[PDB]
Amino acid sequence: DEEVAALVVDNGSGMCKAGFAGDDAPRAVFPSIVGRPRKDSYVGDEAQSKRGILTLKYPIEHGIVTNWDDMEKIWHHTFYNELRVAPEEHPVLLTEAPLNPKANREKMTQIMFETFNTPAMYVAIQAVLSLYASGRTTGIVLDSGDGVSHTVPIYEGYALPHAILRLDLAGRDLTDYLMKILTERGYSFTTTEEREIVRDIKEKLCYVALDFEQEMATAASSSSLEKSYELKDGQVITIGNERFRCPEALFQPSFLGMEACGIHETTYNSIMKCDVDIRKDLYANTVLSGGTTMYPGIADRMQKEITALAPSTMKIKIIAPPERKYSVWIGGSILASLSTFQQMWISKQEYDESGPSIVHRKCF
Numbered sequence: 627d628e629e630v631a632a633l634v635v636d637n638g639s640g641m642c643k644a645g646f647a648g649d650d651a652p653r654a655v656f657p658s659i660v661g662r663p664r665k666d667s668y669v670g671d672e673a674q675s676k677r678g679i680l681t682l683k684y685p686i687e688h689g690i691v692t693n694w695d696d697m698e699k700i701w702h703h704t705f706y707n708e709l710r711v712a713p714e715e716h717p718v719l720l721t722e723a724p725l726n727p728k729a730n731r732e733k734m735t736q737i738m739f740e741t742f743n744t745p746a747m748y749v750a751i752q753a754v755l756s757l758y759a760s761g762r763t764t765g766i767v768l769d770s771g772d773g774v775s776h777t778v779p780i781y782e783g784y785a786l787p788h789a790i791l792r793l794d795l796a797g798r799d800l801t802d803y804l805m806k807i808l809t810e811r812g813y814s815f816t817t818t819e820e821r822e823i824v825r826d827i828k829e830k831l832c833y834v835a836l837d838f839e840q841e842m843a844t845a846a847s848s849s850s851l852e853k854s855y856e857l858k859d860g861q862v863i864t865i866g867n868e869r870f871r872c873p874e875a876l877f878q879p880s881f882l883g884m885e886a887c888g889i890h891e892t893t894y895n896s897i898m899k900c901d902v903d904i905r906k907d908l909y910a911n912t913v914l915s916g917g918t919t920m921y922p923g924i925a926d927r928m929q930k931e932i933t934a935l936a937p938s939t940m941k942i943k944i945i946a947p948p949e950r951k952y953s954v955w956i957g958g959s960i961l962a963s964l965s966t967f968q969q970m971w972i973s974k975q976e977y978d979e980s981g982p983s984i985v986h987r988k989c990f
């Protein structure tokens with residue numbers, strides 16, 4: 627091979643995924659955190675491990691970069707610590723959130739070429755990459771991560787900004803809600819350490835009920851839905867209706883005091899904002915992505931809820947890839963490996979010729 631490996635970096639609100647184009651999975655995943663004492667800067671797992679003696683910062687808390695000084699440190703960490711490569715020696719494909727401000731796109735571009743001296747780079751919308759990973763160029767993606775969720779209609783490879791909806795309800799909120807209801811049950815999960823334990827309980831024992839009320843009735847009259855969970859100190863606790871009550875908040879945000887529409891309604895509203903001529907393509911190609919869409923039963927629940935909102939004559943299909951937790955990264959690996967994509971990279975030459983604003987033309 628003549629070309630060096632290209633890098634794929636998925637910038638997540640909670641976890642960053644990094645690896646090499648062509649691979650089937652990211653080589654590294656770490657917390658999008660930077661910490662400094664209350665070694666001068668700590669990034670990733672280490673910052674989390676030593677959080678006790680540090681003040682943590684979340685530079686991309688809700689999907690959008692808010693502090694470029696710390697984001698630069700996360701990227702430095704990604705190259706030198708996680709992937710152990712020199713960025714000046716490899717093209718880099720970066721991901722961005724839907725509705726990312728134009729100025730931010732230019733900033734990312736300038737930093738890659740001027741700070742890291744990348745030989746080439748490109749930036750793609752997360753939702754679009756997930757759709758690519760599913761083998762489609764048209765459809766609507768419901769991306770629910772750690773700090774944010776989005777419904778992104780995509781037609782012929784292009785996201786439709788006017789129809790994109792943002793929901794400030796995701797994995798983080800669900801974890802805290804589970805801590806709250808488990809505490810109401812009689813336990814006590816309130817500390818940061820306990821938040822990590824509940825996050826684990828959430829990822830392992832929660833599920834989306836097909837019918838909330840029926841599930842609540844079953845849990846109230848029997849122990850058939852109860853599951854045991856063992857804490858590190860040996861204590862075994864019981865999780866009952868909390869298993870499905872937690873993710874139910876995605877469909878009924880009021881449980882969290884939020885007036886926002888649930889994910890099914892948000893998906894429907896995005897589709898309705900699109901040209902009537904492509905709505906059927908979206909209904910027939912609703913793809914789920916992100917860690918928060920991993921709950922067992924979520925696909926069937928979405929199918930049921932969307933069917934209730936859409937015309938009776940509409941064909942509804944929910945696609946839930948088993949590997950959807952990393953579909954963004956995988957889509958990037960696929961894209962960066964495409965023969966026709968090689969001409970699309972922004973080269974250092976092109977950057978020197980046109981400057982940061984070239985990103986709008988090259989990465990439309």
Ligand SMILES: Nc1ncnc2c1ncn2[C@@H]1O[C@H](COP(=O)(O)OP(=O)(O)O)[C@@H](O)[C@H]1O
Binds near residue numbers: 640770771828918
């Ligand atoms: N199996 C699972 N069930 C439910 N939630 C999960 C599961 N696996 C991961 N999560 C949650 O998904 C979120 C992270 O997903 P991710 O798409 O990586 O987000 P981001 O890109 O914003 O960091 C976290 O809140 C995590 O707890």
Ligand SMILES: [Ca+2]
Binds near residue numbers: 638771954
């Ligand atoms: Ca993400």
Ligand SMILES: [Ca+2]
Binds near residue numbers: 884885
């Ligand atoms: Ca409501």
